[PDB]
């Protein structure tokens, strides 16, 4: 199957005490492997997965250098955007950056990403072609013109189709046991009467990896979206995920309802019935 590598960076200005807070997180599919925290005593890129611990000291030295450069640029950019939107010095603001790439089952480059946000709203983004930029507002157009002048889109493409893809391919081979694995969901159903005429049917999916899953309730095979509570997929905290879907059914009609579970870990999709 297809794989992805994503880096998420958050920089939050503190008008009170200390330089802005910089947090960096690295993911291979739904598994975190690296982290950087400006408030932590380490002041280095730290491992979060067992398969990345085999990387040499030069790699960690290089990643730390990149994270210090990222934090410093984010610190200067917070001040630059403050002026662009004509905002006061006493307010806290946030810069978010996402970048990474996708590889196919054969390891071939699929897609490259680079998106930036100011205060949780789109600022500037690299288009799918990795040749042009999309500016969200007038202030972002200033950056767009500056980045076009220095041909920034080409330098982003060099990283995304180069080092980014090479890095992801290497991580997948080193962590084949954990990353190329599929944990199927452990399923069960609960039935609880809310009255003498109605009962809630809740279908569970636990201990699955990757996070991507589909839980759908069906009445006589027809997709029941209307009156179904579907919770957001949540982490269990052990590297696996959880999800549930509930529906209120009339008492004595439980057998007309089926829950459909779709996951890449399952050899065939499941059909659960009370």
């Amino acid at each position: 199957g297809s794989h992805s590598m994503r880096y998420f960076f958050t920089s939050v200005s503190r008008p009170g005490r200390g330089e802005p807070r910089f947090i960096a997180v690295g993911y291979v599919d739904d598994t975190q492997f690296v982290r950087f925290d400006s408030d932590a005593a380490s002041q280095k890129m730290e491992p979060r997965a067992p398969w990345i611990e085999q990387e040499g000291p030069e790699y960690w030295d290089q990643e730390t250098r990149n994270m210090k450069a990222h934090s410093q640029t984010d610190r200067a950019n917070l001040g630059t955007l403050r002026g662009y939107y004509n905002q006061s010095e006493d307010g806290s603001h946030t810069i978010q950056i996402m970048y990474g790439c996708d590889v196919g089952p054969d390891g071939r480059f699929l897609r490259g990403y680079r998106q930036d946000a100011y205060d949780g709203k789109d600022y500037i983004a690299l288009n799918e072609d990795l040749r042009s930029w999309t500016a969200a507002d007038m202030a972002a157009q200033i950056t767009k013109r500056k980045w076009e002048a220095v041909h920034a889109a080409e330098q982003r493409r060099v990283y995304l189709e180069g080092r980014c893809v090479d890095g992801l391919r290497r991580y997948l081979e080193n962590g084949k046991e954990t990353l190329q694995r599929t944990d199927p969901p452990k399923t069960h159903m609960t039935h609880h009467p809310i009255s003498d005429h109605e009962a809630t049917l809740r279908c569970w999916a636990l201990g699955f990896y990757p996070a991507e899953i589909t839980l759908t309730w069906q009445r006589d095979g027809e997709d029941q979206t209307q009156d179904t509570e579907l919770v957001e997929t949540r982490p269990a905290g052990d590297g696996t995920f959880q999800k549930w879907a509930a529906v209120v059914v009339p008492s004595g009609e439980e057998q007309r309802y089926t829950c459909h579970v779709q996951h890449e870990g399952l050899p065939k999709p499941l059909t659960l019935r009370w």
């Binding site: 450069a69 984010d74 950019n77 890095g167």
Partner: peptide
């Protein structure tokens, strides 16, 4: 592996 540098806005 991450980018070596980030550009100013």
């Amino acid at each position: 592996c991450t980018e070596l540098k980030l550009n100013d806005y």
